[PDB]
Paper text:
The non-receptor c-Src tyrosine kinase participates in different signaling processes by phosphorylation of tyrosine residues in a variety of proteins, modifying their properties, such as enzymatic activity, subcellular localization and stability. The c-Src tyrosine kinase is made up of six functional regions: (i) a N-terminal fatty acid-acylation domain, (ii) a unique domain, (iii) a Src homology 3 (SH3) domain, (iv) a Src homology 2 (SH2) domain, (v) a catalytic domain, and (vi) a C-terminal regulatory domain. Of all those, the SH3 domain plays a key role in the regulation of the tyrosine kinase activity through the recognition of an intramolecular Proline Rich Motif (PRM) and, additionally, through the interaction with other PRMs present in other proteins. To better understand the mechanism of 3D-domain swapping formation in c-Src-SH3 domain, and its plausible implication in amyloid fibril formation, we have solved the crystallographic structures of the WT and three mutants at position 128 of the c-Src-SH3 domain.
The structures of the monomeric form of the WT (WTM) and Gln128Glu mutant (Q128EM) of the c-Src-SH3 domain were solved from crystals belonging to space group P212121 with two molecules in the AU. In both structures, whereas chain A could be completely modeled (amino acids 81-140), some residues at the n-Src loop of chain B could not be modeled because of the lack of electron-density in the difference maps. Residues belonging to this cloning tail participate in the binding of a Ni2+ ion through their backbone nitrogen atoms and the Nδ1 atom of His83 side-chain. In both structures, the main differences between chains A and B are located at the distal and n-Src loops. In both monomeric structures, the side-chain of residue Glu106 in chain A (Glu106A) is hydrogen-bonded to Ser123A side-chain and two water molecules, thereafter W1 and W2. A third water molecule, W3, is placed at hydrogen-bond distance of Gln128A side-chain (or Glu128A in the Gln128Glu mutant), the carbonyl atom of Ser101A and W2. However, in chain B, Glu106B side-chain is hydrogen-bonded to Thr125B side-chain (2.8 Å) instead of Ser123B side-chain (distance between Glu106B and Ser123B is 5 Å). Gln128B (or Glu128B) side-chain is oriented outwards from the pocket formed between the diverging β-turn and the distal loop, and therefore, its interaction with W3 is lost. Changes at the folding nucleation site also affect residue Leu100, which is conserved among SH3 domains, and is part of the hydrophobic core with an ASA value <10 Å2. This residue shows different rotamers at each chain: rotamer tp in chain A vs rotamer mt in chain B. The presence of the rotamer mt is allowed by the displacement of the backbone of the distal loop (distance between A and B chain backbone atoms was ∼1.5 Å) and the low steric hindrance of the nearby residue, Gly130.
Residue numbers in the entry: 81 to 140
The structure:
């Protein structure tokens, strides 16, 4: 709930307004994981927020 972050495994570039662009290695908080495929994430590394593909991250 505040104890866990995820790490980005790969680079991803969004061309949609609601997806997050991020680089591998970024530290991400998962904000909304109600859906299995796409999670709302907040990057602590960039301060940006948006949906990410769930298979692009793993728990840190
Ligand atoms: Ni927590």
């Amino acid at each position: 709930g505040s104890h866990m972050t995820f790490v980005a495994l790969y680079d991803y570039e969004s061309r949609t307004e609601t997806d997050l662009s991020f680089k591998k290695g970024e530290r991400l908080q998962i904000v909304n994981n109600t859906e299995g495929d796409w999670w709302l994430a907040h990057s602590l590394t960039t301060g940006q927020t948006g949906y990410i593909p769930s298979n692009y991250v793993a728990p840190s």
